[PDB]
Structure formats: structure tokens, C-alpha cells
Amino acid sequence: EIDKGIYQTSNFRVVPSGDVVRFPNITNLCPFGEVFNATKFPSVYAWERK
Amino acid sequence: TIAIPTNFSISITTEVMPVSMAKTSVDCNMYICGDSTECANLLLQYGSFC
């Protein structure tokens, strides 16, 4: 039930109609092998950063 | 002894008084959760204080 009068309704809504994806141009895979499959690993006290 | 006036003057004075203020409305789904659909559902699974 609604009585006679004027009522304030939600603001005008618009629904999306498209999709946009923008990423940088990269063509190389990250070096998992060199990091994980390294021949020698350092001591914790002399840890290395790359 | 008693003092009585013998002349008169006409003065015009002004009084300023407020009557009404600005009328406003709030879209709570707009202010809270923006256009996000997940936040709207969370608002729903919260409560209707709007």
C-alpha cells in the first residue's frame, strides 16, 4: 500500500555496457628457473637480494 | 517637579528574521558503497536505517 503524494526515489542509475583491460606490453616470462633452480644458495647470515 | 516633552520625531527601524532553511535528500546507497554491487549486497545483509 502507498498513500497519495510525491516521494523521493533513488538517483538515476546506469549499468555498464563494456569491458576495458589495459596492461603493459610484456613478452618475456619471469625467470623461475634461475631463481628456484640455482646451483648454489647463500648462508642465511649472508642472504642475497635480487 | 515634573518634565514633559514639547516635540516629537518619526524614526524608522529594521528587524531581520529567518524563516526557512535549504531542503535536502540523501541516497544512502550512493554515499555508501558507490556503484559497487558487492557492497550493496553487504549493505542489504546489514540493516535498513536508510
UniProtKB/Swiss-Prot annotation, chain B:
Top-rank taxon, per record: Viruses
Protein name as annotated: Spike protein S2
Encoding gene (name): S
Organism, scientific name: Severe acute respiratory syndrome coronavirus (SARS-CoV)
Functional note: Mediates fusion of the virion and cellular membranes by acting as a class I viral fusion protein. Under the current model, the protein has at least three conformational states: pre-fusion native state, pre-hairpin intermediate state, and post-fusion hairpin state. During viral and target cell membrane fusion, the coiled coil regions (heptad repeats) assume a trimer-of-hairpins structure, positioning the fusion peptide in close proximity to the C-terminal region of the ectodomain.
Residues linked to a glycan: 7
Resulting phenotype, residue 9 to L: In strain: Isolate SZ3
